[PDB]
Amino acid sequence: MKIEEGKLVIWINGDKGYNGLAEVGKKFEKDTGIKVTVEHPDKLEEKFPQVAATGDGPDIIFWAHDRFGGYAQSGLLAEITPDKAFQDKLYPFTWDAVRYNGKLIAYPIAVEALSLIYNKDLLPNPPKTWEEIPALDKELKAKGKSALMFNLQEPYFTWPLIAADGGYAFKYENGKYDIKDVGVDNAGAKAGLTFLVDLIKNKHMNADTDYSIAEAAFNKGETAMTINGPWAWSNIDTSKVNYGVTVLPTFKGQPSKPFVGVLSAGINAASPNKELAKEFLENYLLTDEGLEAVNKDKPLGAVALKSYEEELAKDPRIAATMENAQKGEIMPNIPQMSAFWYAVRTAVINAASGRQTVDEALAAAQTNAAAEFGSSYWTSEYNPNAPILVGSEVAYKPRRGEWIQCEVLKVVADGTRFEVRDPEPDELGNSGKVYKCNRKELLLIPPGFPTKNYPPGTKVLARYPETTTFYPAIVIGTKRDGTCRLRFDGEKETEVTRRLVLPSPTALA
Amino acid sequence: ARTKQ
Ligand SMILES: OC[C@H]1O[C@H](O[C@H]2[C@H](O)[C@@H](O)[C@@H](O)O[C@@H]2CO)[C@H](O)[C@@H](O)[C@@H]1O
């Protein structure tokens, strides 16, 4: 039998009620004797596609419905098999969200949407427009408080604003979404981000604000507002803030259009426990007690289960959540969604940090929102390995331990194949020599700013000063400005900018 | 590619 056979392994994002779900798992373990293990790994959304297929990976995966279409398309999720008596217990529209090519590809759980969360003691009346925020912050600054603070590292949070005035993702054309019609480069979109960029220029927000930093700012009462979803209410209650939840601010007289997502559970197609996974989902989780339990840890939002939604239905927070949901649009689920998210995330972090003008970021964002991309076989907790698309820069390991820097000209066969070119003039071409490689012959050189440093002792491939070659090296320490101090093998110590210090594939063996 | 030494 396969190693995964005989038990269940669940994956869920770290901001949901995985402890409340562990409870649902205990009731199940008890009734069947089978073991259930709940995990909340980092960047699970990117690891699932690389480990699920090797025939391994978790048995159940929880994420917003937007990424499920790509998994189903690639054959990583199995077609679920609920009868009609069960299909009736869920809201017909939540089933619509997890359908791909007329096939049900996952069990829906809840409808979640971002709302404006505010402090009542600090702000008895919240602004209705974004344009009131710049003045609201000047007023609040005199008392040592800020007006707004939310995650600027994840595009999902800024999207509501980028969409209010006309920005969209993919156009819903005939009976479908035209991937040839991206709307992240139109004036509607540019006007929203430009407004966001200005808020930062005028010191109303700092581009370093991430998720953790904002949550604390609001829970300690350092800021009057924040834009988050239902799952965040658990921590606020635990704190002191006397808060409220209402509609998002308008922009240019238009409502903020938050992308609406349906948390959903998928069943891995490689799994030998598809039938134990169904038992768990239909009889234990999607039950009044099963949801009530997960809802208790961290609020789920508007639940797909009709009978239990009758409870939260009257809750004002759910009311606001559904209000904003009705004003926004439901995320698509085509395979191009992950490429799309990588492009916008790249454009938002860049425009906000000055590294790129709004025009430049969004223009490129439109160029890579539909692009086919691949990922490197070598992964690292310190450096991203995707997405590798045309125009990307990488470290290539010639068949002929030196790695040369190359540009990517073509991604083919679903990202399992590339055609890279060395830009330095070669005997066969002054434009550069071209090679064909698979996923193990290269490492992605992240184009954006670095996020994590390498612990001292880490083996890496750094580009040597005045060369286009990456040589083996050992990390001594990281200089504050970010820069890595390194001892190069077979030669003072050498200082190389972090952007040129990649993980070692050899060490990763 | 450009090399060392
Ligand atoms: O920001 C990109 C990200 O947006 C959405 O992810 C949300 C998720 O749906 C929420 O439930 C919550 O966990 O916050 C996430 C963003 O931090 C998309 O669902 C996701 O695929 C996309 O990468």
Cα A54 to ligand 1 centroid, rounded to whole Å = 25
Experimental technique of record: X-ray
Q: A506 is written with which tokens?
A: 């050899």
Between A and B, how many residue pairs show a Cβ–Cβ distance under 8 A? 19
DSSP 8-state secondary structure symbol assigned to residue A66: G
| Closest CA relative to residue A41, chosen from A7, A11, A64 | A11
Evaluated on CA atoms A35, A38, A42, A48, the torsion sign reads positive
Helix (H) or strand (E) holding A117: strand A115-119
- Specify the ligand 1 atom closest to the Cα of A15: 13
Do residues A164 and A255 lie in contact, with contact meaning Cβ atoms separated by under 8 Å? Answer: yes
Determine phi and psi for A76, rounding to 5 degrees.
-85, -20
Percent helix, strand, coil in chain B, to 5, is 0, 0, 100
Determine phi and psi for A405, rounding to 5 degrees.
-80, 130
**CA-derived radius of gyration, chain A:** 24
- Specify the ligand 1 atom closest to the Cα of A156: 1
Ordered alpha helix ranges (H), A117-186: 133-141, 155-164
| Closest CA relative to residue A260, chosen from A195, A205, A330 | A330
Minimum Cα–Cα distance from A468: chain B residue:
B2
Helix (H) or strand (E) holding A436: strand A434-437
A405–B4 CB contact, under 8 Å: no
Cα A156 to ligand 1 centroid, rounded to whole Å = 6
CATH 2.30.30.140 location in chain A: 447-509
Distance of alpha carbon A9 from alpha carbon A273, whole angstroms: 10
| Closest CA relative to residue A106, chosen from A294, A326, A302, A286 | A286
A468–B4 CB contact, under 8 Å: no
- Nearest CA to CA, how far is B4 from chain A (Å)? 6
A471–B4 CB contact, under 8 Å: yes
Cα A391 to ligand 1 centroid, rounded to whole Å = 26
- Nearest CA to CA, how far is A471 from chain B (Å)? 9
Do residues A464 and A471 lie in contact, with contact meaning Cβ atoms separated by under 8 Å? Answer: yes
Distance of alpha carbon A378 from alpha carbon A135, whole angstroms: 48
Amino acid at A200: I
B1–A471 CB contact, under 8 Å: no
Q: In whole angstroms, how far apart are CA A49 and each of A67, A364, A374, A444?
A: 10, 25, 11, 18
B1–A468 CB contact, under 8 Å: yes
CATH architecture of the domain formed by A1-113+257-333:
3-Layer(aba) Sandwich (3.40)
Cα A152 to ligand 1 centroid, rounded to whole Å = 12
3-class secondary structure, A486: strand
Minimum Cα–Cα distance from A426: chain B residue:
B1
3-class secondary structure, A468: coil
| Closest CA relative to residue A405, chosen from B2, A70, A278 | B2
| Closest CA relative to residue A136, chosen from A118, A157, A115 | A118
Q: In whole angstroms, how far apart are CA A287 and each of A32, A290, A493?
A: 17, 5, 62
A422–B4 CB contact, under 8 Å: no
- Specify the ligand 1 atom closest to the Cα of A157: 1
- Specify the ligand 1 atom closest to the Cα of A151: 17
Do residues A463 and A450 lie in contact, with contact meaning Cβ atoms separated by under 8 Å? Answer: no
Residues in contact with ligand 1 (CB, 6 Å cut-off):
A 13, 15, 45, 64, 66-67, 112, 154-156, 261, 341
B2–A402 CB contact, under 8 Å: no
**Would you say domain A447-509 falls under CATH 2.30.30.140?**
yes
Cα A2 to ligand 1 centroid, rounded to whole Å = 32
- Nearest CA to CA, how far is B5 from chain A (Å)? 10
Distance of alpha carbon A350 from alpha carbon A353, whole angstroms: 5
CATH 3.40.190.10 location in chain A: 1-113+257-333
Residue A387 preceded by cis peptide, ω within 30: yes
Amino acid at A69: G
Resolution in A: 2.6
Chain A residue numbers touching B5 (CB-CB < 8 A): none
Chain A residue numbers touching B3 (CB-CB < 8 A): 402, 467, 469
3-class secondary structure, A494: strand
Do residues A187 and A81 lie in contact, with contact meaning Cβ atoms separated by under 8 Å? Answer: no
Give chain B's contact residues with A (Cβ, < 8 Å): 1-4
Distance of alpha carbon A162 from alpha carbon A87, whole angstroms: 35
Q: A479 is written with which tokens?
A: 């200089």
| Burial (CB count <10 Å: 0-12, 13-18, 19+), residue A3 | exposed
B1–A422 CB contact, under 8 Å: yes
User: Tokens 């008596």 label which residue?
Assistant: A85
| Closest CA relative to residue A116, chosen from A291, A320, A271 | A320
Chain A residue numbers touching B1 (CB-CB < 8 A): 404-405, 422, 424, 467-469
